[model samples]
Target: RPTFYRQELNKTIWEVPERYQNLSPVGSGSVCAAFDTKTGLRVAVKKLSRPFQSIIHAKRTYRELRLLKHMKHENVIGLLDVFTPARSLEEFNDVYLVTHLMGADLNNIVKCQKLTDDHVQFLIYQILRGLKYIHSADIIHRDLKPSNLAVNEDCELKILDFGLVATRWYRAPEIMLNWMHYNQTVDIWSVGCIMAELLTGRTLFPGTDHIDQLKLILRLVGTPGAELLKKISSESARNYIQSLTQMPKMNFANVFIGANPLAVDLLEKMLVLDSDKRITAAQALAHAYFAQYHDPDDEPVADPYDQSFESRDLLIDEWKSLTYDEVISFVPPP
Candidate 1:
């Protein structure tokens, strides 16, 4: 059997320097930071929140571990090590994951408002590149917002927070409306929201609730057509959308007035009301906005194997059993 899943446990016994100490928590997540005196490197340690707390938590743990283990790309976060203080299954209540520390998140960067057009294009390119790779593997980064994106001083970006990501400001239209069959386009909508925030340093559609979110989107992008509304399987949702007063479409040029025309054009495509019509990550990469940075070589190469591992409906005991087995048997790859 392939041992790729076991590689993260290789450093389970690595010694920590006596002087090493916890620095601070990384942002608002369950992650923390520490300086490793022995390795002389800063590392972010994420303590999985109650991995066995519930079925949902266990499933999230499984998805996050499987995806992180399989994904190998420059724009994605890499797992460094995983360890448990417990000597056996009975005591294994906590799971710790270590990764390379990043300077800041895109949320902090956007708040600083220190980017130029060139900077914006390059940063967005990195996001699209990362999204392209993620989508190629048949994975949808269900959560993509400024905070979930990590960055360094050099502008290098990595996507994170696979399990706990439900920021309302960057949520997709379909998700807000509770559509059952949403796909990768949901991620594209989030990219549009992120792009808008990067350009203006403010959330494009700041909604307080689901209804407010739909209204905000309608106010900016206009209401979806009747045919599009019919696609919503929820009769109540479809009726609610149809009952709302039609709002006039806002001009993209005026919305992103100072932004590059190509950038504005691309943003319009991504922020569409209909999920089917929304620009895909792959298509967005080829847009004219990224012309200066576009390179055929930069496109995502297809994964050698089918990376989509479907086990969403597995029983709670099955999930827990599978997860525990992996943790116990994991061995780092040589």
Candidate 2:
């Protein structure tokens, strides 16, 4: 059996020296660090120092840990351990989580340079496969920014950093309004973001703030109105919607004319405006974009029928409405 480790409280990592601090800062966000465990193995530790108020954000970490615990896929990261408030830390409220440390996240790769059509296709295929399993398990990765993807020494892409991953810009239209409503379509939307970034060498709809991101999405995908809109009743959501004109029809293929034909076909489907009509991770696995071409660096196609759509439907229905504690309990044990 695999054993997990937790960190001691009152030890803000800053308290310890270079060696004992037990961490090396990696990417951006709240507090992401790499540590060497007592077992002499290196691990990545993500802390919720700022405290994400959204249950979905908090739950993404837990969900990723649980899913990785029971899942075995080349494209997914492995969960090594979870560090919550040990009884000592719990007395005052201090906690954290951990995963095996890997090399170079997608953001790092892109920053290194633009990717080839072959490279992007290979990476996206693996991501689709990993997400297909996640959706099959009835989970949605609401956030799909490039930073969340980790590339191992072997060049395999491992989805990492679930914090905000299932709750940010990748959010479907329905989720923007009703905090309690959404589906796996949100994950696919983020994947669309990934595809666009890879093709263009930057974020598809770059926005400095949450509202701006939503506005940009609407601008690219089109405005939500009539029956296309649902769940959003918040004043903030309404104000954001008011700022936009009629949404535009998305034709991303035209935008990336230099991209590979297969990539263009896949990108268009992934960036669809309507979540209802968006291509699913599993459905896209069988699409010509990936299935038609074989990448020497990517994972081979695996069992397609391992999970049922009925399960995802049920999870989405229940998940979209869950509270903090409910979200915590929904995931499999660490």
Candidate 3:
């Protein structure tokens, strides 16, 4: 069975566990960080907000927890520890998760620091590399929060909080489609947006709404084919897309005038509005844009596994029982 120590610090009356010391509240007052006593490494500690309040929230919690526990790629985050002060299931309301922390201001640093092509190549490569692994696991990534990009002087980056997914800049809501069933190509498009931001230090398409999002996309990628406009999932949405004024595709090189045109070539490949036509992670990794950093030996993927748990409409908060059991029984793998 797993072991735990009760901790009552200035920031938490609930259990923060015992190994971590000097726990201090970070922004938003929900999350905090401190040094782990045993490993002497600092970690990010989060008090999950209402893990099992709703069915969606509950299953979402379940997926994220399991994903952290199972996936071991270098770029994806791993769980260092999990804890709760409650000794009984009924009392188990607060769950504290601990994981490796790379920055006090890693986002701040990367956002302020202009990325050279060197940094951009290395940075984008790491994303595609992680995407290579993630896409293999039946995980569509559905999001690419480039803000989550944690880079050091070495330009090494890690993926974090898979669920706090890419919400903007490259959602490609303009993909001549409103796909409820988002595919891997969508995420690749997200990677393209992140790439654009890296080079231009601005969002490729900062859409204020769904219509605006599509407008910005077509403005850059050119108007969708007449048939593509009719392919949208929502009739209302399709009507808007159909009624829209036509705009020709903006030249890629002109979009990022001074950046490497090689990247534009690949960006065009990825930012394809047609999902079937979009570039893949492994495929994009092979593009010449990554020529300087390409190494087939470094890329690896895994067999996809059952993710039906995400699809299961389990009873609201029932997952907490299962979650509590795991926390109580979990012992660090030796």
Candidate 4:
């Protein structure tokens, strides 16, 4: 029942000033700026470029808004106000979506060695829960990278930035190589990538180029056969094999060698090169791997209600807590 615009925050119609500088940069190709209201509350602003004549782009925009409106999951990023183009020829009209800016992204946290296996598992479980609901609504999050997720001030996780998701390499290889219309398999691929980043503290496919991206993935996930490779154009197929052969070893199981088998199995099944052979997000949710996971985080918890706890209810509670506005970190009473 929350409205997109807060009635108390009347002036939701400010023009982006020309000289405004972003308080902090989110990542490459991102336009996020942190600002404060007259009342002194801080928030993050996302500036998005308009999609011209691309139905897919329009669909993605509408898809995000539609899904956000229909489903109210906590793990997902909430859609705030969307500033439509006032007039045509708006070279760069801002979409003006706002959300609670939490702590570092999962990628940054992993890099800093703050994310434990339990943390990783807990985060991925939340992501999967959100994806499950999304797929049920027939929406795919084409982009599911580490940077797209945030750890709020309270150490809670929020899934953000669904702009470039639900597509190729991040998708089941079959869909990318075959150019086939896909379903939830794409989300599975993202979950696989997220798992790798958390376990290894590195981008799963930091390919120097498109070719390298394919090879890096093939090295870890294994490559497709001649029959499947034939689905792609000749030039693309040749490049894929050549680069794949040159890449170093990337055995995913070896990466998380000592970690939980359930996590490893999810990564392996999700990253399958053959889309047809890949596991669906729903199946991954109910897999035998998860069966052993009485606590999805596979770690002990003191307070059963704590989201950081390992219980399934804890995960669902985390998902339900994700809402619009910056998640202001609060000081605990001593």
- lDDT on C-alpha atoms for all candidate structures: 0.72, 0.59, 0.72, 0.53
Mark the regions of model 4 whose C-alpha exceeds 4 Å error after superposition.
1-13, 16-42, 47-64, 82-95, 112-114, 163-180, 225-252, 288-334
List pairs with backbone clashes in candidate 3: 143-166, 144-166, 222-249
Instruction: Please identify which of the two predictions, 2 or 3, would achieve the higher TM-score against the true structure.
Output: 3
- lDDT comparison, 2 vs 3, better candidate: 3
Off by over 4 Å in 1: 1-23, 27-29, 37-40, 87-91, 112-114, 163-166, 233-239, 302-321, 328-334
Tens-digit per-residue lDDT, 1-334, candidate 4: 1223321112233344322233454542134545544323244655433432344443344434434344445666654433433332234333445555665676556663535777666677667766766666556667666667777665577776553221233544444445546666776777887777677666667666555566667777655666655755778656747664644335666677677777777787887765666687666767665553334442211211112211223232222222111112211111
Reference-based TM-score, model 1: 0.83
Cα lDDT of candidate 3 equals 0.72
Task: Give the candidates in order of TM-score, highest first.
Answer: 3, 1, 2, 4
Q: Score residue 67 of candidate 2 by CA lDDT.
A: 49
Angstrom error of the Cα, residue 297, model 1: value is: 1.8
lDDT of 3 at 146: 66
Worst 10 residues of 1 by lDDT: 1-10
lDDT per residue (tens digit) for residues 1-334 in model 2:
2233434443343222122235666643234555553445466665544233344443443344444454556666655544433233223222355566666777777763568877777888888888876666555666666777878776688775442222355555455655565677877878877787777787677666677777777776666655555634566765757667765556665568788787777777877666777888777877777765444345343343322312342332233232223223434223
